[PDB]
Amino acid sequence: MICRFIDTHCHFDFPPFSGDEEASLQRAAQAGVGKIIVPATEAENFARVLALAENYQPLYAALGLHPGMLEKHSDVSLEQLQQALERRPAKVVAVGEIGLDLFGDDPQFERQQWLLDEQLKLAKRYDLPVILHSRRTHDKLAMHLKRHDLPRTGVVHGFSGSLQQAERFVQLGYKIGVGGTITYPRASKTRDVIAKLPLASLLLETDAPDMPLNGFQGQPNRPEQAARVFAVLCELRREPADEIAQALLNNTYTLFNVP
Ligand SMILES: [Zn+2]
Ligand SMILES: [Zn+2]
Ligand SMILES: [Zn+2]
Ligand SMILES: [Zn+2]
What we know:
By secondary structure, the protein is α/β, with parallel strands linked by helices. It is built from nine helices and eight strands.
């Protein structure tokens, strides 16, 4: 098939893609990346992410407030998210890019958690899965997911961590986003985790332009690199490549309803 991969997490509204959407989508397509899910980071970017999803067939969107942009989120940002969701753009498939991140001298962790729960409530209200960011916060994030029990669950994107942390998310019904992290065998033991998880729990992604793959550092990551992440995933798994490719597509469809 021409569309063999779905990058479930690409910040396509940021540079180098902004203003170069046509060429970027063709580079993605020729690599077999046929659809891309674009999660927002803050209310000020909702319009441009919605415009991408409405104007380009391959792009789908998620709206939400990223923990990395905590300083920009106000009660007005949350009201904007709710009103946007109420109008249901349609190619909007998740409440996303929400989560926790303990990086920094003062991550304002309590406020991050309150903000995450406000958005988890919206995902429940509008019956949508969530696209989650978690950096050094897997245990805490799992504690909140277990408590709030979202019927549509979601994906913990760009996962890097222990087998127990991954399995706990999978046991709560969440998927695991597989990106550039698996191309660095000496950076963590995430490759061993991904090699062991059930195939139905995996989604493919890049988190482009961030998370450059091994051997491509120093320049922006791009969605076509999902094809390369896939090649590495095949080296880790026992299943044949065609079975893995089909599973990632089916998993993505089951979670988001993106063909
Ligand atoms: Zn083909
Ligand atoms: Zn993230
Ligand atoms: Zn909570
Ligand atoms: Zn992201």
